[PDB]
Coordinates of C-alpha atoms and ligand atoms in Angstrom, one line a residue:
Chain A
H9 CA 0.0 0.0 0.0
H10 CA 0.8 3.6 -1.0
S11 CA -1.2 6.2 0.8
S12 CA -3.8 8.4 -1.0
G13 CA -6.7 10.8 0.0
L14 CA -9.8 9.0 1.2
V15 CA -12.7 10.3 -0.9
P16 CA -16.2 9.9 0.4
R17 CA -18.4 8.4 -2.3
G18 CA -21.9 7.1 -2.8
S19 CA -25.4 7.8 -4.2
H20 CA -25.8 10.2 -1.3
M21 CA -22.9 12.4 -2.4
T22 CA -22.9 15.5 -4.7
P23 CA -20.4 15.3 -7.6
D24 CA -17.4 17.6 -7.6
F25 CA -17.0 17.7 -11.3
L26 CA -19.2 17.1 -14.3
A27 CA -18.1 15.7 -17.7
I28 CA -21.1 16.0 -20.0
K29 CA -20.8 14.4 -23.4
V30 CA -23.4 15.1 -26.1
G31 CA -23.7 12.5 -28.8
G32 CA -23.6 13.5 -32.4
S33 CA -26.8 11.6 -32.9
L34 CA -28.6 14.4 -31.0
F35 CA -27.6 17.3 -33.2
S36 CA -26.2 16.1 -36.5
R37 CA -27.1 13.6 -39.2
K38 CA -23.9 11.7 -40.0
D39 CA -25.1 11.1 -43.6
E40 CA -25.7 14.8 -44.2
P41 CA -22.4 16.6 -44.7
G42 CA -21.9 19.7 -42.4
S43 CA -25.3 19.1 -40.9
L44 CA -25.7 20.7 -37.6
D45 CA -29.1 21.1 -36.1
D46 CA -28.9 24.6 -34.9
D47 CA -32.1 24.4 -32.9
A48 CA -30.8 21.3 -31.1
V49 CA -27.6 23.1 -30.4
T50 CA -29.4 26.2 -29.2
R51 CA -31.7 24.3 -26.9
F52 CA -29.0 22.0 -25.4
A53 CA -26.8 25.0 -24.9
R54 CA -29.4 26.7 -22.7
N55 CA -29.5 23.6 -20.5
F56 CA -25.7 23.2 -20.4
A57 CA -25.4 26.9 -19.5
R58 CA -27.3 26.3 -16.2
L59 CA -25.0 23.4 -15.3
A60 CA -22.0 25.4 -16.1
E61 CA -23.0 28.2 -13.8
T62 CA -23.3 25.8 -10.8
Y63 CA -20.3 23.8 -11.9
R64 CA -18.2 26.9 -12.7
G65 CA -14.7 25.7 -13.2
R66 CA -15.9 22.2 -12.4
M67 CA -17.3 21.0 -15.8
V68 CA -16.4 20.2 -19.3
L69 CA -18.7 19.8 -22.3
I70 CA -17.6 17.2 -24.8
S71 CA -19.1 17.1 -28.2
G72 CA -19.7 14.2 -30.4
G73 CA -18.3 14.5 -34.0
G74 CA -21.5 14.1 -35.9
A75 CA -21.3 14.6 -39.6
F76 CA -18.1 16.4 -39.3
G77 CA -16.2 13.7 -37.5
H78 CA -17.6 10.8 -39.3
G79 CA -17.0 12.6 -42.7
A80 CA -13.3 13.1 -41.9
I81 CA -12.9 9.4 -41.0
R82 CA -14.9 8.3 -44.1
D83 CA -12.9 10.5 -46.5
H84 CA -9.3 9.8 -45.1
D85 CA -6.9 7.3 -46.8
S86 CA -6.1 4.3 -44.5
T87 CA -2.8 3.7 -46.3
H88 CA -1.6 7.0 -44.8
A89 CA -2.6 7.4 -41.3
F90 CA -1.6 11.1 -41.6
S91 CA -4.7 11.8 -43.7
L92 CA -6.6 11.4 -40.4
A93 CA -5.3 14.9 -39.6
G94 CA -8.4 16.3 -41.2
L95 CA -10.3 14.9 -38.2
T96 CA -8.7 17.5 -35.9
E97 CA -10.1 20.2 -38.2
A98 CA -13.5 18.5 -38.4
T99 CA -13.9 18.2 -34.6
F100 CA -12.6 21.8 -34.1
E101 CA -15.6 23.0 -36.2
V102 CA -18.0 21.2 -33.9
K103 CA -16.4 22.6 -30.8
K104 CA -16.6 26.1 -32.3
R105 CA -20.3 25.7 -32.9
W106 CA -21.0 24.8 -29.3
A107 CA -18.7 27.4 -27.9
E108 CA -20.1 30.2 -30.1
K109 CA -23.6 29.3 -29.0
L110 CA -22.8 29.1 -25.3
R111 CA -20.9 32.5 -25.4
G112 CA -24.0 34.0 -27.0
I113 CA -26.0 33.2 -23.9
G114 CA -23.3 34.4 -21.4
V115 CA -21.2 31.3 -20.8
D116 CA -17.4 31.6 -20.8
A117 CA -17.1 28.7 -23.3
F118 CA -13.6 28.1 -24.8
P119 CA -12.9 25.3 -27.4
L120 CA -9.7 23.3 -26.8
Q121 CA -8.1 21.1 -29.4
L122 CA -7.5 17.8 -27.6
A123 CA -4.7 16.9 -30.2
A124 CA -2.7 20.0 -28.9
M125 CA -3.0 18.7 -25.3
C126 CA -2.9 14.9 -25.4
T127 CA -1.0 12.1 -27.0
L128 CA -1.3 8.3 -26.8
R129 CA 1.4 6.1 -25.0
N130 CA 0.9 2.3 -25.0
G131 CA -2.7 3.1 -26.0
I132 CA -3.5 5.2 -23.0
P133 CA -4.3 9.0 -23.5
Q134 CA -1.8 11.2 -21.7
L135 CA -2.7 14.9 -20.8
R136 CA 0.4 16.7 -21.9
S137 CA -0.8 20.4 -21.5
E138 CA -1.4 22.3 -18.4
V139 CA -3.8 24.6 -20.1
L140 CA -7.0 22.5 -19.5
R141 CA -6.5 22.8 -15.7
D142 CA -5.8 26.5 -16.0
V143 CA -8.9 27.2 -18.0
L144 CA -11.0 25.4 -15.4
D145 CA -9.3 27.3 -12.6
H146 CA -10.1 30.5 -14.4
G147 CA -13.8 29.4 -14.1
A148 CA -14.2 29.0 -17.9
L149 CA -16.0 26.1 -19.6
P150 CA -13.8 23.9 -21.8
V151 CA -15.5 22.7 -24.9
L152 CA -13.9 19.4 -25.9
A153 CA -14.4 16.7 -28.6
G154 CA -12.8 13.6 -30.0
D155 CA -9.7 14.0 -32.2
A156 CA -6.9 12.6 -34.2
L157 CA -4.1 12.0 -31.6
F158 CA -0.5 11.2 -32.1
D159 CA 1.0 8.1 -30.5
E160 CA 4.6 7.7 -29.4
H161 CA 5.5 6.4 -32.9
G162 CA 4.0 9.4 -34.7
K163 CA 0.9 7.4 -35.9
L164 CA -2.4 9.2 -35.8
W165 CA -5.4 7.5 -34.2
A166 CA -9.1 8.5 -34.1
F167 CA -9.9 9.0 -30.5
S168 CA -13.6 9.2 -29.9
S169 CA -15.4 11.9 -27.9
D170 CA -16.7 8.9 -25.8
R171 CA -13.1 8.4 -24.5
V172 CA -12.4 12.0 -23.6
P173 CA -13.6 11.6 -20.0
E174 CA -10.6 9.1 -19.6
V175 CA -8.2 12.1 -20.0
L176 CA -9.7 13.8 -17.0
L177 CA -9.1 11.0 -14.6
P178 CA -5.6 12.0 -13.3
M179 CA -6.6 15.7 -13.3
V180 CA -9.9 15.7 -11.4
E181 CA -10.0 16.0 -7.7
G182 CA -12.8 14.6 -5.8
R183 CA -15.9 13.0 -7.3
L184 CA -16.2 13.0 -11.1
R185 CA -19.6 12.3 -12.6
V186 CA -19.5 11.4 -16.3
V187 CA -22.7 11.7 -18.3
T188 CA -23.0 10.4 -21.8
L189 CA -26.1 11.7 -23.6
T190 CA -27.2 9.5 -26.4
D191 CA -30.2 8.4 -28.4
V192 CA -31.2 5.5 -26.2
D193 CA -32.1 5.3 -22.6
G194 CA -29.1 3.2 -21.5
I195 CA -27.8 -0.3 -22.2
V196 CA -30.7 -2.4 -23.5
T197 CA -30.7 -6.1 -22.5
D203 CA -35.9 -5.6 -23.9
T204 CA -35.2 -3.6 -20.8
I205 CA -32.6 -1.1 -19.6
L206 CA -29.8 -2.4 -17.4
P207 CA -30.0 0.1 -14.6
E208 CA -26.7 -0.7 -12.8
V209 CA -23.3 -2.0 -14.1
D210 CA -20.5 -2.9 -11.7
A211 CA -17.3 -1.8 -13.4
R212 CA -15.3 -4.4 -11.6
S213 CA -17.1 -7.2 -13.5
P214 CA -19.3 -5.7 -16.3
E215 CA -19.5 -8.9 -18.4
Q216 CA -23.3 -8.8 -18.5
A217 CA -23.4 -5.3 -20.0
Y218 CA -21.0 -6.4 -22.8
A219 CA -23.2 -9.5 -23.4
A220 CA -26.1 -7.1 -24.0
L221 CA -24.4 -5.2 -26.8
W222 CA -23.8 -8.6 -28.5
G223 CA -27.6 -9.1 -28.3
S224 CA -28.1 -5.5 -29.9
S225 CA -24.8 -5.0 -32.0
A232 CA -20.6 3.2 -30.7
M233 CA -22.0 1.7 -27.5
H234 CA -19.0 -0.6 -27.0
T235 CA -16.7 2.4 -27.0
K236 CA -19.0 4.1 -24.5
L237 CA -19.0 1.1 -22.2
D238 CA -15.2 0.7 -22.4
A239 CA -14.6 4.4 -21.6
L240 CA -17.1 4.5 -18.7
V241 CA -15.9 1.3 -17.2
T242 CA -12.4 2.7 -17.3
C243 CA -13.5 5.8 -15.6
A244 CA -15.7 4.0 -13.0
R245 CA -12.7 1.8 -12.1
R246 CA -10.9 5.0 -11.2
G247 CA -13.8 6.2 -9.0
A248 CA -16.0 8.0 -11.4
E249 CA -19.9 7.8 -11.3
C250 CA -20.8 7.3 -14.9
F251 CA -24.1 7.3 -16.8
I252 CA -25.4 6.4 -20.3
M253 CA -28.8 8.1 -20.8
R254 CA -31.0 9.7 -23.4
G255 CA -30.4 13.2 -24.5
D256 CA -33.2 15.6 -25.5
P257 CA -32.5 19.2 -26.5
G258 CA -35.2 20.7 -24.3
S259 CA -34.9 18.4 -21.2
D260 CA -33.9 20.1 -17.9
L261 CA -30.6 18.8 -16.7
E262 CA -30.6 20.4 -13.2
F263 CA -30.8 16.9 -11.6
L264 CA -27.2 16.3 -12.9
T265 CA -26.0 18.6 -10.0
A266 CA -27.7 16.4 -7.4
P267 CA -26.9 13.1 -5.6
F268 CA -28.1 10.2 -7.6
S269 CA -30.4 9.0 -4.8
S270 CA -32.2 12.4 -5.2
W271 CA -32.9 12.2 -8.9
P272 CA -36.4 12.5 -10.2
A273 CA -38.2 9.2 -10.5
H274 CA -38.8 9.5 -14.3
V275 CA -35.1 9.6 -15.1
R276 CA -33.9 6.4 -16.8
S277 CA -30.2 5.5 -17.2
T278 CA -27.5 2.9 -17.0
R279 CA -25.3 3.7 -14.0
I280 CA -21.7 2.4 -14.1
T281 CA -19.7 2.4 -10.8
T282 CA -17.6 0.3 -8.5
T283 CA -18.8 -0.4 -4.9
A284 CA -19.9 3.0 -3.7
Chain B
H9 CA 28.2 32.7 -14.8
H10 CA 26.1 29.6 -15.3
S11 CA 27.4 27.2 -18.0
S12 CA 25.5 26.6 -21.2
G13 CA 26.2 25.0 -24.6
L14 CA 28.4 27.1 -26.9
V15 CA 26.5 27.4 -30.2
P16 CA 28.5 28.4 -33.3
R17 CA 26.7 31.2 -35.0
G18 CA 27.2 33.6 -38.0
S19 CA 26.3 34.4 -41.6
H20 CA 28.4 31.4 -42.6
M21 CA 26.2 28.9 -40.6
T22 CA 23.2 26.9 -41.8
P23 CA 20.0 27.3 -39.6
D24 CA 18.9 24.4 -37.6
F25 CA 15.3 25.4 -37.4
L26 CA 13.0 27.6 -39.5
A27 CA 10.1 29.6 -38.2
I28 CA 8.3 31.0 -41.3
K29 CA 5.6 33.5 -40.8
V30 CA 3.2 34.4 -43.7
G31 CA 1.5 37.7 -43.2
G32 CA -2.2 38.0 -43.7
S33 CA -1.6 40.8 -46.2
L34 CA -0.3 38.2 -48.6
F35 CA -3.4 36.0 -48.8
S36 CA -6.4 37.7 -47.3
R37 CA -8.0 41.1 -47.6
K38 CA -8.8 42.2 -44.0
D39 CA -11.8 44.2 -45.1
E40 CA -13.3 41.3 -47.0
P41 CA -14.9 38.9 -44.4
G42 CA -13.7 35.3 -44.8
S43 CA -11.5 36.2 -47.8
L44 CA -8.8 33.8 -48.4
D45 CA -7.0 34.0 -51.7
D46 CA -6.9 30.3 -52.6
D47 CA -4.4 30.9 -55.4
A48 CA -2.0 32.7 -53.0
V49 CA -2.4 29.9 -50.5
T50 CA -1.9 27.2 -53.2
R51 CA 1.3 28.8 -54.6
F52 CA 2.8 29.6 -51.2
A53 CA 2.1 26.1 -50.0
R54 CA 4.2 24.6 -52.9
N55 CA 7.1 26.7 -51.8
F56 CA 6.6 26.0 -48.1
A57 CA 6.4 22.2 -48.9
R58 CA 10.0 22.3 -50.3
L59 CA 11.3 23.9 -47.1
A60 CA 9.4 21.5 -45.0
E61 CA 11.0 18.5 -46.7
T62 CA 14.5 19.8 -46.0
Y63 CA 13.6 21.1 -42.5
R64 CA 11.6 17.9 -41.6
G65 CA 10.8 18.2 -38.0
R66 CA 12.8 21.4 -37.9
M67 CA 10.2 23.9 -39.1
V68 CA 7.0 25.6 -38.2
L69 CA 4.7 27.6 -40.5
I70 CA 2.9 30.5 -38.7
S71 CA -0.1 32.1 -40.4
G72 CA -1.2 35.6 -40.1
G73 CA -4.9 36.0 -39.2
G74 CA -6.0 38.0 -42.2
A75 CA -9.7 38.8 -42.5
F76 CA -10.5 36.0 -40.0
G77 CA -8.3 37.4 -37.1
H78 CA -9.0 41.0 -37.7
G79 CA -12.8 40.3 -37.9
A80 CA -12.8 38.5 -34.6
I81 CA -10.9 41.4 -32.9
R82 CA -13.2 44.0 -34.7
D83 CA -16.4 42.2 -33.6
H84 CA -15.5 41.4 -29.9
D85 CA -16.8 43.5 -27.0
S86 CA -13.9 45.2 -25.1
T87 CA -16.1 45.4 -21.9
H88 CA -15.8 41.6 -21.7
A89 CA -12.4 40.3 -22.6
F90 CA -13.9 36.8 -22.9
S91 CA -15.6 37.8 -26.2
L92 CA -12.1 37.6 -27.6
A93 CA -12.5 33.8 -27.4
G94 CA -13.9 33.9 -30.9
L95 CA -10.3 34.8 -32.1
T96 CA -9.2 31.3 -31.3
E97 CA -11.9 29.9 -33.6
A98 CA -11.0 32.5 -36.3
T99 CA -7.3 31.7 -36.3
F100 CA -8.1 28.0 -36.2
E101 CA -9.9 28.4 -39.6
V102 CA -6.8 30.0 -41.1
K103 CA -4.5 27.2 -39.8
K104 CA -6.9 24.7 -41.3
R105 CA -6.8 26.3 -44.7
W106 CA -3.0 26.1 -44.7
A107 CA -2.8 22.6 -43.3
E108 CA -5.4 21.2 -45.8
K109 CA -3.6 22.7 -48.7
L110 CA -0.2 21.4 -47.6
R111 CA -1.5 17.8 -46.9
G112 CA -3.0 17.9 -50.4
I113 CA 0.6 18.2 -51.8
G114 CA 2.0 15.5 -49.5
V115 CA 3.2 17.5 -46.5
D116 CA 2.4 16.2 -43.0
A117 CA 0.9 19.5 -41.9
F118 CA -1.0 19.5 -38.6
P119 CA -2.7 22.6 -37.2
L120 CA -2.1 23.3 -33.5
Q121 CA -4.2 25.7 -31.4
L122 CA -1.7 28.0 -29.6
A123 CA -4.3 28.7 -26.9
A124 CA -4.4 25.0 -25.9
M125 CA -0.6 25.0 -25.6
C126 CA 0.5 28.5 -24.2
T127 CA -0.5 31.0 -21.6
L128 CA 0.8 34.4 -20.6
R129 CA 2.6 35.0 -17.3
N130 CA 3.8 38.6 -16.5
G131 CA 3.3 39.3 -20.2
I132 CA 5.6 36.6 -21.4
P133 CA 4.2 33.6 -23.4
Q134 CA 4.8 30.2 -21.7
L135 CA 4.7 26.9 -23.7
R136 CA 2.6 24.7 -21.4
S137 CA 2.1 21.7 -23.7
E138 CA 4.7 19.1 -24.7
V139 CA 2.8 18.3 -27.9
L140 CA 4.5 20.9 -30.1
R141 CA 7.9 19.3 -29.5
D142 CA 6.5 15.8 -30.0
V143 CA 4.9 16.8 -33.4
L144 CA 8.2 18.1 -34.6
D145 CA 10.0 15.0 -33.4
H146 CA 7.6 12.9 -35.4
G147 CA 8.8 14.8 -38.4
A148 CA 5.4 16.6 -39.0
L149 CA 4.9 20.3 -39.8
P150 CA 3.1 22.3 -37.1
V151 CA 0.8 25.0 -38.6
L152 CA 0.6 27.8 -36.0
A153 CA -1.1 31.2 -35.8
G154 CA -1.8 34.0 -33.4
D155 CA -4.5 33.5 -30.8
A156 CA -6.5 34.6 -27.8
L157 CA -4.3 33.5 -24.8
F158 CA -5.2 33.4 -21.2
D159 CA -3.1 35.2 -18.6
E160 CA -2.5 34.1 -15.1
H161 CA -5.6 36.2 -14.0
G162 CA -7.9 34.5 -16.5
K163 CA -7.9 37.5 -18.9
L164 CA -7.8 36.8 -22.6
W165 CA -5.3 38.8 -24.7
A166 CA -4.9 38.9 -28.5
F167 CA -1.5 37.4 -29.2
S168 CA -0.3 38.2 -32.7
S169 CA 1.1 35.6 -35.1
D170 CA 4.1 38.0 -35.3
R171 CA 4.9 37.0 -31.7
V172 CA 4.6 33.2 -32.1
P173 CA 8.3 32.8 -32.8
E174 CA 8.9 34.0 -29.1
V175 CA 7.2 30.8 -27.9
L176 CA 9.9 28.7 -29.7
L177 CA 12.8 30.2 -28.0
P178 CA 13.2 27.9 -25.0
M179 CA 12.3 24.9 -27.1
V180 CA 14.6 25.2 -30.1
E181 CA 18.0 23.8 -30.0
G182 CA 20.7 25.2 -32.1
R183 CA 20.3 28.0 -34.6
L184 CA 16.8 29.3 -35.1
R185 CA 16.1 31.4 -38.2
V186 CA 12.9 33.4 -38.1
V187 CA 11.5 34.7 -41.3
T188 CA 8.5 37.2 -41.4
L189 CA 7.0 37.5 -44.9
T190 CA 5.2 40.7 -45.4
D191 CA 4.1 43.2 -48.0
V192 CA 7.2 45.4 -47.8
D193 CA 10.8 44.6 -48.4
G194 CA 12.0 45.3 -44.8
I195 CA 12.0 48.3 -42.4
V196 CA 12.0 51.5 -44.6
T197 CA 14.0 54.4 -43.3
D203 CA 13.4 56.0 -48.4
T204 CA 15.6 52.9 -48.2
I205 CA 15.5 49.5 -46.5
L206 CA 17.6 49.2 -43.3
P207 CA 19.5 46.1 -44.1
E208 CA 20.9 45.3 -40.6
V209 CA 19.5 45.9 -37.1
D210 CA 21.4 45.1 -34.0
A211 CA 19.0 43.8 -31.4
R212 CA 21.2 44.9 -28.6
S213 CA 20.5 48.6 -29.5
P214 CA 17.8 48.8 -32.2
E215 CA 16.7 52.4 -31.5
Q216 CA 17.2 53.5 -35.2
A217 CA 14.8 50.8 -36.5
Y218 CA 12.1 52.0 -34.1
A219 CA 12.8 55.6 -35.2
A220 CA 12.0 54.5 -38.8
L221 CA 8.6 53.3 -38.0
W222 CA 7.8 56.7 -36.4
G223 CA 8.8 58.1 -39.9
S224 CA 6.4 55.6 -41.6
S225 CA 3.7 54.8 -38.8
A232 CA 1.9 45.8 -37.4
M233 CA 5.5 46.6 -38.0
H234 CA 6.1 47.6 -34.4
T235 CA 4.9 44.3 -33.3
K236 CA 7.1 42.5 -35.8
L237 CA 10.2 44.5 -34.7
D238 CA 9.4 43.8 -31.0
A239 CA 9.1 40.0 -31.5
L240 CA 12.1 39.7 -33.7
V241 CA 14.3 41.8 -31.4
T242 CA 13.2 39.6 -28.6
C243 CA 14.1 36.5 -30.6
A244 CA 17.5 37.9 -31.8
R245 CA 18.5 38.8 -28.2
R246 CA 18.1 35.0 -27.5
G247 CA 20.3 34.0 -30.5
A248 CA 17.9 33.9 -33.4
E249 CA 18.7 35.2 -36.9
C250 CA 15.6 37.1 -37.9
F251 CA 14.3 38.6 -41.1
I252 CA 11.6 40.9 -42.3
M253 CA 11.2 40.6 -46.0
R254 CA 8.6 40.7 -48.9
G255 CA 6.5 37.6 -49.5
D256 CA 5.3 36.6 -53.0
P257 CA 3.3 33.5 -53.6
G258 CA 5.3 32.2 -56.5
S259 CA 8.8 33.1 -55.2
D260 CA 11.3 30.3 -54.6
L261 CA 12.3 30.1 -51.0
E262 CA 15.1 27.5 -51.2
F263 CA 17.6 30.2 -50.2
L264 CA 16.0 30.2 -46.7
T265 CA 17.8 26.8 -46.1
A266 CA 21.2 28.4 -46.8
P267 CA 23.7 30.5 -44.8
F268 CA 22.9 34.2 -45.1
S269 CA 26.3 34.9 -46.7
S270 CA 25.2 32.5 -49.6
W271 CA 21.9 34.2 -50.4
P272 CA 21.2 35.3 -54.0
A273 CA 22.1 38.9 -54.6
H274 CA 18.6 40.0 -55.5
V275 CA 17.1 39.2 -52.1
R276 CA 16.2 42.3 -50.0
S277 CA 15.5 42.1 -46.3
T278 CA 16.0 43.6 -42.8
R279 CA 18.2 41.3 -40.8
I280 CA 17.9 41.4 -37.0
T281 CA 20.7 39.8 -35.0
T282 CA 23.1 40.4 -32.0
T283 CA 26.8 40.1 -32.7
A284 CA 27.3 36.9 -34.8
Ligands
ATP301 N1 -27.3 -2.9 -25.7 C1 -27.4 -1.7 -26.3 N2 -28.2 -0.8 -25.7 C2 -28.4 0.5 -26.2 N3 -27.8 0.9 -27.4 C3 -27.0 0.0 -28.1 C4 -26.8 -1.3 -27.5 N4 -26.0 -1.9 -28.4 C5 -25.7 -1.1 -29.4 N5 -26.3 0.1 -29.2 C6 -26.3 1.3 -30.1 O1 -25.5 2.3 -29.7 C7 -26.1 3.6 -30.1 C8 -25.5 4.7 -29.3 O2 -24.2 4.9 -29.8 P1 -23.9 6.0 -31.1 O3 -22.4 6.0 -31.2 O4 -24.8 5.7 -32.3 O5 -24.6 7.4 -30.5 P2 -24.0 8.9 -30.3 O6 -22.5 8.9 -29.9 O7 -24.9 9.3 -29.2 O8 -24.1 9.7 -31.7 P3 -23.3 9.5 -33.1 O9 -24.4 8.7 -33.9 O10 -23.0 10.8 -33.9 O11 -21.9 8.8 -32.9 C9 -27.6 3.3 -30.0 O12 -28.4 4.1 -30.9 C10 -27.7 1.8 -30.3 O13 -28.1 1.7 -31.7
ATP302 N1 9.5 51.6 -41.4 C1 8.6 50.8 -42.0 N2 9.0 50.0 -42.9 C2 8.2 49.1 -43.6 N3 6.9 48.9 -43.2 C3 6.3 49.7 -42.3 C4 7.2 50.7 -41.5 N4 6.4 51.2 -40.6 C5 5.1 50.7 -40.7 N5 5.1 49.8 -41.7 C6 3.9 49.0 -42.1 O1 3.9 47.7 -41.7 C7 3.2 46.9 -42.7 C8 3.5 45.4 -42.5 O2 2.8 45.0 -41.3 P1 1.3 44.4 -41.5 O3 0.8 44.0 -40.1 O4 0.3 45.4 -42.3 O5 1.5 43.2 -42.5 P2 1.2 41.6 -42.4 O6 1.3 41.0 -41.0 O7 2.2 41.1 -43.4 O8 -0.3 41.3 -42.9 P3 -1.8 41.8 -42.2 O9 -2.1 43.0 -43.0 O10 -2.9 40.8 -42.4 O11 -1.6 41.9 -40.6 C9 3.7 47.5 -44.0 O12 2.8 47.3 -45.1 C10 3.8 49.0 -43.7 O13 2.6 49.7 -44.1
FCN303 C1 -13.9 11.5 -33.1 C2 -14.9 11.2 -34.2 O1 -16.0 12.3 -34.3 C3 -16.4 11.0 -33.9 P1 -17.0 10.8 -32.2 O2 -16.3 11.7 -31.2 O3 -18.5 11.2 -32.2 O4 -16.9 9.3 -31.8
FCN304 C1 -4.0 37.3 -33.9 C2 -4.8 38.1 -35.0 O1 -5.0 37.5 -36.3 C3 -4.1 38.7 -36.2 P1 -2.3 38.5 -36.6 O2 -1.8 37.1 -36.2 O3 -2.2 38.5 -38.2 O4 -1.6 39.7 -36.0

């Protein structure tokens, strides 16, 4: 044993930090180039803005790539991994769209290029820039997304927005809550699986085999949960009030449906 | 005295690293929103691509903001320094345009958001991300630009592309050559001032008072020259061959006109 800070955890506890990920399905049609649903962005932004005020300096917003990200990956040449570099430009545009919208309603939203801040080493993302922590400490809202990241051999890899919360794990103090908003109510097994134990999540993986994206979400959120995070897969809706995401899980409204991924506590 | 590596320097010596800055005047009309001269970008890119091959892993390309940067600064609200955040999005677009063009002709060009990598402390830019060095070591071409940078108080400042070479100073080993391509042949005093000693450049500053942008260039290049760099202000032209920028200054073609800023050596 090495010593570390004992962190109180449980469904009774308020999160110290929110990582909110908004799936591309919710504001973009992959098979419509450059599509962004401005109404969806507008409405989500209003709900994200209220979270950001409470979680000032204690939140990130992570955007899915939508048409932009999936186009960049579709149009690259796999014989030259460097052609993936266009993905960094694609996912910058989506971050811009969120940040512009949020600033328009008074949120101090700043887009940050994950590729300028993070690289891969033995497959694990490494935060390599101090700027993310600074931005948070200034009380601003980082707008993040997936990206094309370099590995230690100079090879670019597509790193999904779904995995971005992994990057926060060494940086966040206290209780991290990760919320992945998608176009389904959770992991469907048909019923939702309401609880997954990240120590042994084999039944959640077995459910995706039943129903064939979601694998990547599960992988990322298990990884996060094994490092103490309280993670959720749940349905996004542009107009839905998200104030409950500030609250202890045991206090959530009864109508809310999700898959909750944790280790004991 | 503290010891340090003795670096051979002089007009007889080949540069170890090239920082090439392309002024917005050369490819963009400030007062035409979103203007980018695609032909100018195309032609410059072909000439930059030859430098990047020789200087593989030993060069950065820095873009002026043009219409994009100056629009963002024009349209921000000075009563809320955070509205400058749109400048980061503006100068990302210009980096994208260069990097797309360069990749199209086989250069491993990758845009990097300076704001994600650098902050200001007591007015001095601080490189805060290890990713720039990595990208270079991978043999890629960073595409840089000016940006909105945070200070230590959380205030955003417009940091010109002209100042970006300053950020390289602690990072570059060996002889850095900085080349600022603009729409004039150098500092006009009318004749060009061919040599400026960065230790006491008072006559170059006196010339700008004669002729009223250029002040910022001089400040940045003096700063760089005082830390060993060999710096140039010279006229850019999309079709002009730049191969001479790989060569010792004493070997440059006789037709080339510039203002050279150095300390002794
Ligand atoms: N067991 C499962 N339960 C729920 N969804 C599942 C399951 N297995 C696979 N999925 C699929 O995963 C999808 C969610 O992942 P997906 O990557 O499509 O969404 P997103 O990231 O929100 O948006 P985008 O479509 O732009 O990537 C669901 O729509 C569903 O089709
Ligand atoms: N003594 C001087 N010698 C030469 N140019 C000078 C002098 N004093 C002021 N200048 C001005 O500085 C200009 C170059 O700086 P400027 O910022 O306009 O160019 P740029 O960065 O290349 O492009 P952009 O116009 O988009 O910023 C010249 O066109 C000139 O008008
Ligand atoms: C990184 C690529 O845009 C996709 P995702 O982030 O939605 O998985
Ligand atoms: C940073 C603002 O775009 C301008 P410049 O980089 O051309 O000075």
